[PDB]
């Protein structure tokens, strides 16, 4: 819980608990007992809804796909949906198992093949690569059930890189890849339908659990432009004769006059 | 007063604040419980751990800021650089010391921060990875040059807007990072101790830059009553508790 | 067979539930957890770090670093320098660490810290009155009215930063994040206490301000944040 408020009478002190220093890079400890006359207040609120586990552990949407010919593919990443990508880009390193739930409006009999990294996925339905011996697969009938399965932390390091300030190839190389793109791939999910019944919309809800965030950061203050790319200059009109005009798309509203708001 | 002595070199200050200790941890060596390679790491401990003072920059009216990538800034600073090039991996904490002093007539402020994994944004438009030559400028630093529509777009130039931290996040929230402020009214230097912050025990000192030192002129530099319109800023970085492993040929060309 | 019943709420997928799920990839051994410095356990710890407020966010300053400071000068008469309506949805707070954490939560209840810093020469001095008009109270628009609420008076010398702790004055127990008329938080107005006297005739001083949360600040009812949008599709 949060601490209670202590009483505070009139104080005439020579050590001001108000005059701090912003330059020292430390925040002030000034509680309202230092500025005014407080009363004892049994305060029992908790920030239990703010800890990383309950903050991120809510099973948001990570990606949508569309079964074209009873087949669709999705490479696991949080980079497509800005709302959850921002909550992740709060922190630098994150370590979490994830719990994938598939909300599909299809009807019939579907199959999900979690392709671990480094192998070839089925390039279409009724491919030979679907008969797999070791690639873990999930069968389900969308009516009567939502398929769900946990992927443990597949990291190749002690955490996930939300931001990576490095490359993967040495200096003189030519196809160097900035960012977190090479640092990790979580495989991919290949969906197919064995029947013909339902729609084609598949939503992948992923819930980070057993989270352990590592380095806080300034939350993203600009709308994204690409994935894995942390650009923010939006090039809105590529066709017209202004393509070289780059919007900014921030969220700082302006007020008409200071000292009047 | 203050005095910071690492091997072979001494830093002295007179109007200095309390030294910031990034995330409350001092730089330490790699414990056996956390190590993953088998080869025995090397410990220079007196020829690598010392204050290498990079070039001085010119703080003028209209300078937007400078950022130094680490450990890339020290890649040619003595035996620390020589070990960076001759070893497959390495980890090191740093002791970053910033120095700027003007007068009792000058005014202004600098927000001196230390960003882990400062993944820079592209200078704009199409999806293009920023060039290797630009996020690895060496000790010369990188002048920020400020935002504009006329900045060059070729070769993956990094972002030049200091308000958005050159990465898309607002300035002023940069204070969540281990930082300090050089207010020419009250202090004239800033010291920051940073441990090795990375999700892996050691990684290549050339491909990956863990930290990034960023100095932004939060408030411009007024000369006041004195004909001095610019002041040099000097950055004196010192590795500390550095260790490398996996010897090999020089990764130069 | 043991008699079981499936009440309502037992074939559904609620995004915010807490269930166990079958581990795909069994026998999988995750890589070891090493000590990375800086571990965070609670986002309110982010909301307790001071962050600058864009106090000069006028239509010519947004997008420029000069939106973080306002310029004060020597005026003969008292003036209202700056007003910050305590609304954690107002673009002043909604862009700082405090506000950007609090905007994920529908309600917040606690005390705020606001640390004013004056960046000027070493010879410039002055006194400012930082007043907080409690909820239900009109915007002061005169120092004789502003000084009746929670206010402090800070000098300027040898130390430049000063903190007003906006205390938790409210009827209810929680104050809505998106400011409305029922739970409004009041205003924080900055007034010239005696002046700002620079060493020269036309000297100026540049004032900044940071906001943070006191240890007794709490939040509830996590929601989407209005401080992020997605109109395009990320490719």
């Amino acid at each position: 819980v949060v601490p209670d408020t202590k009483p505070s009478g009139p104080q005439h002190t020579t050590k001001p608990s108000i005059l701090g220093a912003m330059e020292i890079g430390a925040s002030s400890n000034a509680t309202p007992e230092s500025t005014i006359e407080t009363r004892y207040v049994y305060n029992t609120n908790t920030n239990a809804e703010a800890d990383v586990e309950m903050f991120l552990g809510r099973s948001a949407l990570w990606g949508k796909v569309t079964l074209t010919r009873q087949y669709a593919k999705w490479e696991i990443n949080f980079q497509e949906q800005a709302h959850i990508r921002k909550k992740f880009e709060f922190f630098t390193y994150l370590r979490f198992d994830m719990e994938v739930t598939i909300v599909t409006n299809n009807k019939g009999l579907m199959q999900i093949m979690f392709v671990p990294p480094g192998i070839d996925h089925p390039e279409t339905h009724d491919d030979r690569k679907w008969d797999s011996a070791s690639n873990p697969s999930v069968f389900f009938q969308p009516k009567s059930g939502f398929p769900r399965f946990t992927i443990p932390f597949t990291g190749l390091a002690s955490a996930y890189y939300m931001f990576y300030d490095g490359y993967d190839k040495p200096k003189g190389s030519d196809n160097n890849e900035y960012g977190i793109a090479p640092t990790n791939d979580m495989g991919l999910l290949c969906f197919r339908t064995l029947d013909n019944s339902g729609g084609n919309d598949v939503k992948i809800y992923v819930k980070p659990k057993h989270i352990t965030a590592w380095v806080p950061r300034p939350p993203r203050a600009t709308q994204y432009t690409h994935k894995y790319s942390t650009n923010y200059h939006y090039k809105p009109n590529s066709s017209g004769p202004d393509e070289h005009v780059l919007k900014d798309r921030h969220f700082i509203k302006t007020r008409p006059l200071i000292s009047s708001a | 007063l203050k005095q910071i002595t690492i091997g072979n070199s001494t830093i002295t200050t007179q109007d200095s604040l309390h030294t910031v200790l990034a995330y409350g941890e001092w730089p330490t060596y790699l414990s056996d419980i956390d190590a993953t390679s088998v080869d025995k790491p090397t410990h220079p401990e007196t020829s690598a751990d010392r204050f290498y003072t990079l070039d001085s920059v010119e703080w003028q009216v209209g300078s937007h800021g400078w950022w130094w990538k680490l450990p890339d800034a020290l890649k040619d600073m003595g035996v620390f650089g020589q070990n960076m090039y001759y070893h497959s991996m390495g980890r090191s904490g740093f002791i970053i010391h910033t120095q700027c002093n003007a007068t009792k007539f000058h005014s202004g402020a600098l927000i001196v921060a230390v960003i882990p994994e400062h993944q820079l944004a592209y200078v704009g438009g199409v999806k293009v990875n920023v060039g290797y030559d630009h996020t690895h400028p060496g000790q010369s630093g990188h002048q920020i040059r400020g935002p504009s529509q006329s900045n060059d777009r070729s070769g993956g130039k990094p972002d030049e807007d200091p308000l958005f931290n050159c990465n898309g996040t607002l300035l002023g929230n940069i204070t969540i990072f281990p930082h300090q402020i050089i207010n020419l009214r009250t202090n004239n230097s800033s010291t920051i101790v940073v441990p090795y912050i990375n999700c892996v025990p050691m990684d290549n000192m050339l491909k990956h830059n863990n930290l990034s030192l960023v100095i932004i002129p939060l408030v411009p530099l007024r000369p006041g009553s004195s004909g001095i319109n610019s002041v040099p800023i000097t950055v004196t970085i010192a590795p500390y508790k550095s260790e490398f492993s996996g010897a090999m040929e020089a990764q130069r060309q | 067979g043991l008699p079981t019943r499936l009440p309502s709420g037992s074939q559904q997928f609620m995004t915010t539930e807490d269930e166990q799920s079958p581990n795909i990839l069994p026998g999988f051994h995750p890589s070891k957890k090493i000590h990375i410095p800086g571990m965070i356990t609670n986002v309110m710890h982010m909301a307790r770090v001071d962050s600058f407020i864009p106090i000069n966010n006028i239509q010519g300053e947004v997008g420029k670093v000069s939106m973080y400071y306002i310029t004060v000068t020597k005026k003969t008469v008292t003036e209202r320098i700056l007003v910050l309506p305590l609304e954690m949805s107002n673009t002043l707070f909604a862009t700082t660490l405090l506000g950007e954490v609090l905007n994920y939560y529908a309600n917040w209840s606690g005390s705020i810290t606001i640390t004013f810093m004056c960046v000027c020469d070493a010879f410039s001095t002055g006194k400012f009155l930082v007043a907080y008009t409690p909820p239900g109270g009109k915007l002061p628009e005169d120092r004789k009215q502003a000084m009746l609420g929670v206010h402090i008076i800070w000098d300027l010398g040898l130390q430049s930063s000063c903190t007003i702790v906006v205390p938790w004055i409210s009827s209810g127990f929680y104050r809505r994040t998106k400011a409305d008329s029922f739970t409004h938080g009041g205003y924080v107005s900055l007034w010239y206490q005696t002046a700002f006297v620079p060493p020269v005739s036309g000297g100026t001083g540049s004032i900044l301000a940071t906001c943070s949360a006191c240890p007794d600040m709490s939040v509830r009812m996590l929601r989407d944040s209005p401080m992020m949008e997605q109109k395009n599709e990320l490719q």
Binding site: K209 | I176 | D18, P22, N23, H45
Partner: peptide, 25 residues
């Protein structure tokens, strides 16, 4: 507190602010 899948990664949700706000020596 039962774990029905006999595995750690299958469990549900699991459960000092001075590292920031005071990172001084």
């Amino acid at each position: 507190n039962i774990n029905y899948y006999k595995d750690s990664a299958s469990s549900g949700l699991s459960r000092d602010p001075s590292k920031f706000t005071q990172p001084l020596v």
